[PDB]
Structures are given as C-alpha cells and as structure tokens.
From Swiss-Prot, chain B:
Record's protein name: U3 small nucleolar RNA-associated protein 18 homolog
Superkingdom of the organism of origin: Eukaryota
Crosslinked positions (Glycyl lysine isopeptide (Lys-Gly) (interchain with G-Cter in SUMO2)): 23
Subunit structure as annotated in this protein's UniProt entry: Part of the small subunit (SSU) processome, composed of more than 70 proteins and the RNA chaperone small nucleolar RNA (snoRNA) U3.
Free-text function comment from the UniProt entry: Part of the small subunit (SSU) processome, first precursor of the small eukaryotic ribosomal subunit. During the assembly of the SSU processome in the nucleolus, many ribosome biogenesis factors, an RNA chaperone and ribosomal proteins associate with the nascent pre-rRNA and work in concert to generate RNA folding, modifications, rearrangements and cleavage as well as targeted degradation of pre-ribosomal RNA by the RNA exosome. Involved in nucleolar processing of pre-18S ribosomal RNA.
Gene that specifies this protein: UTP18
Family, similarity comment: Belongs to the WD repeat UTP18 family.
Compartment list: Nucleus, Nucleolus
UniProtKB/Swiss-Prot annotation, chain C:
Range of the intact protein held here: 348 to 396 of 445
Tissue: Expressed in the endometrium during decidualization. Expression is down-regulated in preeclampsia decidual tissues.
Official protein name in the record: DDB1- and CUL4-associated factor 13
Superkingdom per UniProt: Eukaryota
Localisation per UniProt entry: Nucleus, Nucleolus
Subunit organization: Part of the small subunit (SSU) processome, composed of more than 70 proteins and the RNA chaperone small nucleolar RNA (snoRNA) U3. Component of the DCX(DCAF13) E3 ubiquitin ligase complex, at least composed of CUL4 (CUL4A or CUL4B), DDB1, DCAF13 and RBX1. Interacts (via WD40 domain) with DDB1. Interacts with ESR1 and LATS1.
UniProtKB/Swiss-Prot annotation, chain D:
Record-stated family: Belongs to the UTP14 family.
Subcellular location field: Nucleus, Nucleolus
Subunit-level organization: Interacts with DHX37.
Ranges of Basic and acidic residues composition bias in the record: 1-8
Post-translational modification: Citrullinated by PADI4.
Residues recorded with modification Phosphoserine: 20
Domain of life, per lineage: Eukaryota
Name of the featured protein: U3 small nucleolar RNA-associated protein 14 homolog A
Misc. comment: The human genome also contains the UTP14C gene, an autosomal retrotransposed copy of this X-linked gene. Evolution of autosomal retrogenes from X-linked progenitors compensates for X-chromosome silencing during male meiosis.
Function: May be required for ribosome biogenesis.
Tissue spec. comment: Ubiquitously expressed.
Curated annotation (Swiss-Prot), chain E:
WD repeat feature ranges: 52-93, 94-131, 133-171, 174-213, 216-255, 258-295
Protein's UniProt name: WD repeat-containing protein 46
Keywords: Nucleus, Phosphoprotein, Repeat, WD repeat
Role according to the record: Scaffold component of the nucleolar structure. Required for localization of DDX21 and NCL to the granular compartment of the nucleolus. Part of the small subunit (SSU) processome, first precursor of the small eukaryotic ribosomal subunit. During the assembly of the SSU processome in the nucleolus, many ribosome biogenesis factors, an RNA chaperone and ribosomal proteins associate with the nascent pre-rRNA and work in concert to generate RNA folding, modifications, rearrangements and cleavage as well as targeted degradation of pre-ribosomal RNA by the RNA exosome.
One annotated Gene Ontology cellular component of this protein: nucleolus
Region feature (Disordered): 397-452
Subunit structure: Part of the small subunit (SSU) processome, composed of more than 70 proteins and the RNA chaperone small nucleolar RNA (snoRNA) U3. Interacts with DDX21, NCL, NOP2 and EBNA1BP2.
Major subcellular site: nucleus
Amino acid sequence: MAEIIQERIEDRLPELEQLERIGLFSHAEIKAIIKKASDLEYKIQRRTLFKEDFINYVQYEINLLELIQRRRTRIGYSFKKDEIENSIVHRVQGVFQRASAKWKDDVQLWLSYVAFCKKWATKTRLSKVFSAMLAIHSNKPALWIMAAKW
Amino acid sequence: AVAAAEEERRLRQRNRLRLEEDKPAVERCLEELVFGDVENDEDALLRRLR
Amino acid sequence: NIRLWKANASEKLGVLTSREKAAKDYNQKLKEKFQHYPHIKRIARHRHL
Amino acid sequence: KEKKKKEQMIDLQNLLTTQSPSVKSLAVPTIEELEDENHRQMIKEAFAGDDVIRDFLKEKREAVEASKPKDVDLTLPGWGEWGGVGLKPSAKKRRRFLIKAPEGPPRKDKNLPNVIINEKRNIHAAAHQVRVLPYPFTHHWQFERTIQTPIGSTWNTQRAFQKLTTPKVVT
Amino acid sequence: TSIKAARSELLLAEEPGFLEGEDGEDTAKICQADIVEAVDIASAAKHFDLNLRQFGPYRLNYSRTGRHLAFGGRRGHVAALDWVTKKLMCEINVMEAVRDIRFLHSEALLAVAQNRWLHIYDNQGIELHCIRRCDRVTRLEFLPFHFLLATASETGFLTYLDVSVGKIVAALNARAGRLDVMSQNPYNAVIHLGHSNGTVSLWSPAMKEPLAKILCHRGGVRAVAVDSTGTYMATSGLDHQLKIFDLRGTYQPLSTRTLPHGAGHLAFSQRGLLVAGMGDVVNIWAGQGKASPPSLEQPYLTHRLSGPVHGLQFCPFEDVLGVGHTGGITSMLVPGAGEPNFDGLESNPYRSRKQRQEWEVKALLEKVPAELICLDPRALAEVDVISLEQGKKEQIERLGYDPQAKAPFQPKPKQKGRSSTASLVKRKRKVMDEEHRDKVRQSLQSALDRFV
C-alpha cells in the first residue's frame, strides 16, 4: 500500500531540495508539489487501476517540466540538468512503460508515449519505443511509415 | 566557508526576488496547474469571495 | 534410493510478493543481530538426533 | 566523622532551598467565598511538619551501612590455647584470623546527596543479557553500538530499511 | 543528522499552532472567549462545558488515540463517549464510589477503581472482570507496551496486572503508609510514588524494593509528572513550591517557584507544556522546550473553573486540555499543545476497524516482558561482566535449585550375586572412595646449624 507510495516520494526529495538551493522555487511551493504528487501517487498504486489516473500523473510532470524551463530562462541558469530534468523524465518513462504493458491495444497511448520521447528523451530511448510498438502492432501499415519517417 | 554559504544564501534571495516581480500570463496559468489556487490569508480570501 | 532435500529447510519456494520478501529480509537481519544472546542460541541450535 | 554528617546536612539544606521567587501573573485559587458578597494576599509559610532532612539522612546512612562488605573473625577462644571467662584470645591471634572482604565498587549515589539508589541486581533481566564479548568485536562500545541501532521500518525510512536489510546472496 | 533532520520536515505536512499577543498584551489575561471567536469553526466546536452537578466531582481519561474520552464521578456515574463527534458510547451506574478511571490499550476496555474492588467494563457498558485481589485502589495507570496495569491502594500496596493473560505478575508492599500520588514515565516505564516524607520512589515489578528514592520537597508531595521524553520531572508539595528535576542522571532542581497553594494536579503535553491544577484555577506554562525545561517565570494561559479541579489531561494529538471538577467537565483550547504529525500505524485517529484489529495483533506479538523494566530502556544492549560463581549463585535463586548438581550415588541392583544389599554397601563405598580421591587432589592445589 502506502509503503510503495512512501517509497516513491522519498525518491522525489533530492531534486526538490536542489530546486530550493537554486532559488527557483520557494519552500512553500516545494510543500505544494509534494502534497499534489502524493495524491496522484495514491491513485496509480491502488488495486483497482484506471487509465485516466496514469494520464493525470503524466500530465502533471509535463506541466512541472514546463514551469521549471520558463523560470530557468529568466534566471539564466543552465546547470544541474541531470539532477533535476533527467530525474523527472526517467520517472515519467516508468509510468508510460507500466501503462503500455497494462493496455497494449491502445494505439493512442502508444503515440502519446512516442510524442513524449521526441520532446524529452534520448533518441536511443525512442528507438526502443517504436520497436516495442511495432512488435504487437505490425498489422497497421501507417505505424511503419511513422517510424520510417522519423 | 561561512562567507561562501552566505554568498549562496544571498544568491537564493536575489533569484527569488527576480522570479516574483514580473510574471507572464503563461506562467500564471502554469502555476495554477502545478500549485493550485489556494489562499491562506483571511482578508485576501474574503476579497476573493466577495 | 535417492532422496531430495531442501538446502534451506524453512524458505518458501514459489514466487513471492513485495511484503513477503521484505519480511524475509527483516527476519534474517534480526536473527544475525541477536545471534549471541543466550535465549536465541538455545532455540536456534537445538536439533533432534 | 561527625564533620561528614555536618557537611552532608549542609548541602542537603542547600539544595532544598526555602526562599524562591513567586510567579508574576498567576491566577489565584479561591480560598473563601462570602455568600453575602475578594482574593486576599497570603502568608507564604503556612506549613509545619516533621524534620524530613534528618529522616532522609538517617535512611541513607543505614542504606550505606547495609551494603558494605563484612569482616569475618574466625577465632575460636580455646582452640589450642586456654579458654575461660577471664582468659581471652590475644589481639594478635584476632588479627591473624580476621579476614577482610575486598573493597567493593563505588555506590552510584555517593555524589548524589538527595538520592538513594538500590544496589541489588535484577537477575531475571540479567538472564537475557550476553555474558562474554563476541569474537569479532574488540571493544564493548562497538558491540553496544551495533545492538542499539534499530533496523525496523518503525524507526527508519523505507530506503533506510531496505539498505539496512540487504541480503548478501541473491540468486 | 541535520540533513536527516532536513529530509524530515518535507515529509511532515502540518505545523503546530501558536498564540502571540501584540502591543505588550499579556497572554495570561486572554480568556477562552477571545480564542474561540478568532479560530476556525472546527476548533471552536472542541470547546464545550458539560454541567453535571448532581453527582460527585469527575475524573477523566483520554484514550491513547485522542478520539475517545471516558470519565467517572465520585458518586458512581461512569460514561464513555467519542468527544469529537457528540455521541455517547455508554452511560452506566456503578453502585458505589469511584476513585479513578483509565483506558486499556484501546477504547474497547475500561477499568474503574471502585470503592471496594477493581472492575473491567466494555465501552458499551458491559462488565467483564471484577478483580477481587485489587482492593481499595486510589490511583490507576496503564503501561501500554508491556500490557501492564498498575494500581496504588489505600492499604499501602502496589500491584501489577497483566491484562494480556489475566494474571497478577507482582504485588509489592511500599511500606510507606497510604498511597495516593502516582505517575509513570512513558520513556522509562517506571512508576513514581509521592509520600508525606517529601520523597519520590521509583518502582519496577521485578524488584521488591524501590529502585530509587529522591528527596524533593520540605513537606508532603502532592503531585508528580514527567515529560514524554523522560527527561524532566515536575513536582509540587505543601511547602508551596513547584520544582523541575533533571531525570537524566542528575536529579537536581532546575527551576523553583513559590505558589499560593500546592498544585493538586500536574500534567505534560506532547510538546512540553506544563499545567498546574490549583483548587478551582488552572495555569499553563509554556517554554521553547528545545533541550530546555519550561519557563516558570510567567504563565502562558489561565482559566478559572466553576469548581475545584479533580483531574487534568491533554488530548494526545489535539490542542485541547481536559479538566474535571465538581461542576462537571470542561474542554479548554490550548494552541500549540498537541503534536501535529502522528504516525498512521501506531496511533491513528482516522483508523477503520480493520486497521485497528491489525494493529492490536502486531502489538500483542510484540509485548515486552515485565522483568525487562529498568531505569535504562537500552540496558539489554550492555554486556554484564560478573564472576563465574556470581552467575552460578544467581542461577540458583531464579530457579530454586542447581540444574547441574549431582545427586548422591545409589548403586543399581544387579544379578549374579550382586543384589544381596551386602554388595550394595560395598559398591557404594568403592565409588565414594574414588570421588574422595578427586577432592584431595584438588585440595592440595653456625657449625651446628646443619643438625637443626
């Protein structure tokens, strides 16, 4: 139960405390992120699972990634991408992998995974996503063209 | 290293000031998604309700 | 005859859940932590012969 | 010897100080209510009793006296020498057959003037403890540090619990 | 540990309350009416005044989880209720006087100290056990992690009862007269007893004599209390003194003040606030508490009750103080008294029945035996060095016999001429001679000057 939920929140702490050290976020804003991330974590760690909670979890991190990006430009701070951005991106990929395993037949979920990998992920990561999708969806000619186009 | 820590402390204070003075309308829209719409000051909340 | 035995006589063989694995590691560390206490030694080392 | 009891009466009288300041804005309890109706200022000292410090000093004295070891005289009055009412074993013979018990460890409450501490050991609790230092440890403090640190999830975060319970062989 | 401390606050979600005056205002003169209007409606509902004048003055106990409250009247009125919601679990009439009330590890079980014996009740009013041994009990107090209930009696006896099994583990004769003042150390699990001598005695079920005696007052001790950490002890007496002692190996008075009257009742909150019960008047001192005892210089809050006070306790995880008196029961609002962040697995106010019954099984499997209670909770880690004969002696008293002693030799009856009892005395003598060899071996382990 929450011991897995408590497991995941502690992993989020080291990047949040770095955001406080740079001054990008205030201490009150750090508290708000922790509270909302905990609520989204409870939905996806239940015994009863819905596709909508995974989308809500993913959409929250994307909005958080944009808010960090806009503030870094105004400060002109470009360091510590690995400790902050790569931590969030790696966590989002785990959620997509769990969701794609649960709902293999949903092409829209697969394409959303591909769209995120283009914007935020390494090209070698996107190579795996196309190969995984084409393995179970080889009967759709349009999906082949999208991989060849890329 | 005490002065170096104080140097980092004022750098946080300088960056925190610059991030609050001027905020584009896009950032306000994003901040509601990430932080929510919560008011903890009583008179400020009363102005919102009225 | 040929006989088959368990190398560890108390472990559970099948696929385990996270709570089962967490308790098993906790039990092993607890036994090692208090291995020198007289009551622990008396029970642990008793074999029927 | 009476110098010691004088001194140990002195410092006990010093710890249990009689004069102390009062509380400033303290709400005053009701002492009297007039049905046909007013808090009144008090005399500070409105108590008398038995001399408690004397009793405590007595009791600590007998507690100390009981716990000390004993000196055993094994002299037999007429063993190998003449014995009778007028005749007594010589002082040198008393010295030769008077065994002294070894001087014991210091009491926990010698320097604690207002405290009396029992010296008897809890044998039932001692039944559980380890008697000899185990092999890999070279100092007692190392072993007690190892025992004292909790490993359960009650006292540790989940990462701390998992790193503290890491198995050595995984197959 | 600061980085370990730093990670702590982020996980913690709540902050303690405060109360600061402005423009030189004294918080002592602030009344409860001003606080109620200035705080949210949920907290305002926690301030109420029950009026029960017909029956005697009331003693109260809060459940270990702050959800439940139980109280008992002197004339024999006993009722248990949820206090957050205003529902009545039970209200019964015990047919004689009641001196104390305590919960037992949950809200399910109630123990009452009646006039003549001790009784056990359900939270619905059903009597469960009547303990005939415990008689004329004045004070009750429960040790949670050992499942022990401690009783102080009029006759001068201190008794320990194991509620898990139902057996009395120990019954100790204090031999100091009447016993009426009792408290426990949550950190230490020892029992503190006050006396007219001016001394406080420390007791454990293992010993037949007190662990320690400390002289604290020039008159009779009327109240005693210790903090949750086990560091400080607060006492009051007929000598009009409030004292704070350091229990961490020092036993010296850290602070002293003179009072109009000796404090009948004292208590500690979970954040270190100290409350004194003086007749019909209640006074609260607050201190920073960060490695420091509370400041006795000036009180933090005050209130005047309708009748003289007969019982005080802070709710575990709330900013409220429960007061029992002759008029009835009142609830005060004390901002900053309760500990904000509770653990969901040990004492959850917001727990279901299935969560509760999982917790109790865990605790029952995990009970600490009675003999392990000592002044140091970590004494089991320490390695005891004693002589080999010292261990041999101690094994005898705990058992009543030597388990390695050899019984005197008796020859077995044998055939071919060896059963005539003339051979038995011969074979016995032969063996005893061989053993006699062993003990004697162990026992041994100028010109004319030449003729002299």
